[PDB]
Amino acid sequence: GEIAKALREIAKALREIAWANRENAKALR
Amino acid sequence: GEIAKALREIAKALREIAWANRENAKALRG
Amino acid sequence: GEIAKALREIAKALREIAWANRENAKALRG
Amino acid sequence: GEIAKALREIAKALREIAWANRENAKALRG
Amino acid sequence: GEIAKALREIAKALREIAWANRENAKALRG
Amino acid sequence: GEIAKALREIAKALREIAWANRENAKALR
Amino acid sequence: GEIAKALREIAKALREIAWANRENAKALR
């Protein structure tokens, strides 16, 4: 369904934030 | 539907946050 | 509808977080 | 409705995060 | 309702993130 | 219900992010 | 249900942000 597919896009975006934040920790190290 | 469209709007805004957070990592690199 | 309208405010608030985070990246760049 | 009201409360909390994050940018610029 | 109650805990958790992020801005000033 | 428990799961994860973010502030001091 | 599963995927992605942010605090220390 359209609602469940949108919620899965929100999850994917949050995983991209996690990856971006791991780039920061790398950058600090 | 209106609800699905608004949730996809939320996903897009979270992709904007991901891009901004990566620029923070790159500014610490430079 | 009231639920869709509130979801679109959530998206707008996330866009404001992205803007703030972009401001950080600029401040780090100096 | 109680769901819409709770979603608006989420949006307000996200606006608080945006203000906090901008203050991090202001504290880096000093 | 159980859904609205859960959404209000989401909002409360987000206000805790804002508070944590305001602590960061204070640590940077220091 | 399954939806409400999942939303409570989201709130707890956000409480983990608040703790982590505060640790970042503690590591600056 | 598909909606509850997608909400649980959102919670898992937020836990992945928390882990990133905990790592970021260790990299500052």
Author numbering:
A (entry chain F), F (entry chain D), G (entry chain E): 1 to 29
B (entry chain G), C (entry chain A), D (entry chain B), E (entry chain C): 1 to 30
Lines quoted from the article behind this entry:
αHBs are oligomers of 5 or more α-helical peptides that assemble into coiled-coil structures with central solvent-accessible channels. The αHBs are loaded with an environment sensitive dye (in this case, 1,6-diphenyl-1,3,5-hexatriene, DPH) that binds within the channels and fluoresces.
Despite the requirements for aliphatic residues at a and d, up to 40% of these can be changed to other side chains without compromising barrel integrity. We introduced mutations at one or two of these sites to generate four groups of αHB: Group I had entirely hydrophobic interiors, but with different sizes and shapes of channel; Groups II and III had polar uncharged or polar charged residues, respectively, at specific points along the channel; and Group IV had aromatic residues installed in their channels. The eleven Group II peptides comprised: single mutants to Cys, His, Asn, Ser or Thr at d sites; and double mutations to His, Asn, Ser or Thr at consecutive a and d sites. Focusing on the small molecules, the αSA signal from the more-polar AAs and CHOs is dominated by the polar and charged Group II and III αHBs.
